Symmetry: D2
Subunit: 205 residues, 4 copies
């Protein structure tokens, strides 16, 4: 069923900001594990669904409840990393270039400048007390306004919050290169953020 996506850059294309060593593990091992876990979880739930169809008991319901956590976690890991690679690019492919169009206008109007939005996001990233993510989002329910939200583990933004830029704050995203110095990673990553993709996501809603 679900598979790893293809990359638009080889593993070392984001150096010196993110190492090829990190990207290789992050994609081939971490992302793949979420792919596998999500495939497995949805399979198990199909099976339990059929079991419940013939025997709709509290006992059968309990097992379904048990599996929904793995659907959430692995589904989240699958989708978050897909967002992540797609909002990263080498400088040679426009990584680090500022956003355009309606997204650029909204950023200036709401935050004053891109740098102010990046500062806010770095504060949110440093504030993740555990594993998690920060997302720059477009909120479709309050007039399409930008915000920045944190999630923990592989929780994600759904429904009316549209993700524009995802930034991974799990330690595996930086530890081999930056070790404990997560703030240096949060600072560096903007040099390869694909704001063209964020602008397209803002438009597509």
């Amino acid at each position: 069923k679900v598979t790893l996506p293809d990359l638009k850059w080889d593993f070392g294309a984001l150096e010196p900001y993110i190492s090829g060593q990190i990207n290789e593990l992050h994609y081939t091992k971490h992302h793949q594990t979420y792919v596998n876990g999500f495939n497995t979880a949805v399979d198990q739930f199909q099976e339990l669904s059929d079991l419940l169809a013939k025997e709709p008991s509290p006992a059968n319901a309990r097992k379904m409840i048990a599996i929904q956590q793995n659907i959430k976690f692995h589904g989240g890991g699958f989708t978050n990393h897909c967002l992540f690679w797609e909002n990263l690019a080498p400088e040679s492919q426009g990584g680090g270039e500022p956003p355009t169009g309606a997204l650029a206008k909204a950023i200036d109007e709401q935050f004053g400048s891109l740098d102010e939005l990046i500062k806010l996001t770095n504060t949110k990233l440093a504030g993740v007390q555990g594993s998690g993510w920060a997302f720059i989002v477009k909120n479709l329910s309050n007039g399409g306004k930008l915000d920045v939200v944190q999630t923990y583990n592989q929780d994600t933004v759904t429904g009316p919050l549209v993700p524009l830029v995802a930034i991974d704050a799990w330690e595996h995203a930086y530890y081999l290169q930056y070790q404990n110095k997560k703030a240096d990673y949060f600072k560096a990553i903007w040099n390869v953020v694909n704001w063209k993709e964020a602008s397209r996501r803002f438009d597509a809603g």
Copy 2:
């Protein structure tokens, strides 16, 4: 698919400990809503499963993630209330009579007496800071030892924790009769707890 279970007592059979007014609403309205929500949630997930089978995208994954919370919540509400009615009985049907067999032995060995186990459980119930449940459980992974655990909302015990007695701490479980005096409800309910059923659950594992 899932339906409300039948009751072994008419709504007013647990008076003066739980009113007929409460039982009527709790069963016909609250439990039914969880039945409906669980049926609806599993349906939506079957649909999304088929959508993912043909198009395994991060976008399609996001929608599945979104629905798993309703599967957990409504599935939990369905199963918890099923446990609840089945561990309640009027005095005329042995409600309030102490447990028997291997459960009775474990209670005395671990807690000293039933009253001590009830005290602990009432402390756990009063400590639910929000809506939730206390469950007396048998833990299959540590040698079958008894414990008491709290859950919030419609979260439940799964896997190696076997529920023996479920006690509802949501305000709808008591408010019409006891209003804010939840401790009076926690005290009263033991008079109609079906420890015969708890003993059977302990044996069945």
Copy 3:
């Protein structure tokens, strides 16, 4: 230390939308319990602070960790209900009258109309799967934009999210009058929401 605030209306002043019976219990019992718990929690933490000052052990730290949950919960219950009464008013005191000034402008620009903002908030209230709150907020970090957020239990909005209108979704807020029909309560309460106060909160930031 902290005490219950005074009310700007007698308990029955919000009828037929919220009963005097509910307001009496909600204020004299529920709010008072949070007042007491918050006072007690901060006292215990002062004591533990002094203990740690003389003996900064992991053991002493563990006890402080244990008490911070009661500070959060009771502190939240204290502050949320204070917000709540202050954003409610009888019709004779302007309850139900639409907001004014910069808040009114922001609502129309972001949501199209007050009714649309109320609809969104009612969706958020019905979506609280357990006990909790919805808050209409002003977000100071994204240019002062309005949003609506849910919290569970007595969790609250802090820091850059300024609460403008708080709506209690705990069952004790409605059960005596509406029982399970929470949607009827969410619909009715807007008739006595004090939008003058929300407008002042929006300005004061």
Copy 4:
């Protein structure tokens, strides 16, 4: 106020199971940050306490609520890592030697063997979906029975759960050596677990 504890082994004393490189960062950087954050958090709360003493407002309460998360997180990080080093030892100091006394008896009676308890704990560690910990505990409320519990982030065991062995599952605990292969780390660490200390903790309760 709180400070880093002294180690009973130099950083490389747990090789080849945990590298000196990891221990150096884990102690000097990670643990120190929690020390600093806990000191800072308790200071801020003392200040807010005094502010509330003179002005017990919902506004002042909101700020205290805001700080309790940092007390929990950093307090937890401080205490968890203190537990951690104290339950690790080089083989030359008895690391890896089985527990003794009443703890050894309880393990055999409840789990059948130490290996079975270790297997269960490794399952719990691999099941932490994010950052967190597994703790082998003695539960004082159910007759002193052993169990294994998971926590997330720097959440900890408090009150009636006595921690006997703490095992860190944050990625920084293993990533430099094992990278994604967390199961290899969970397997290896038992070779340097200080079961003498766990046995003393079991006795001291």
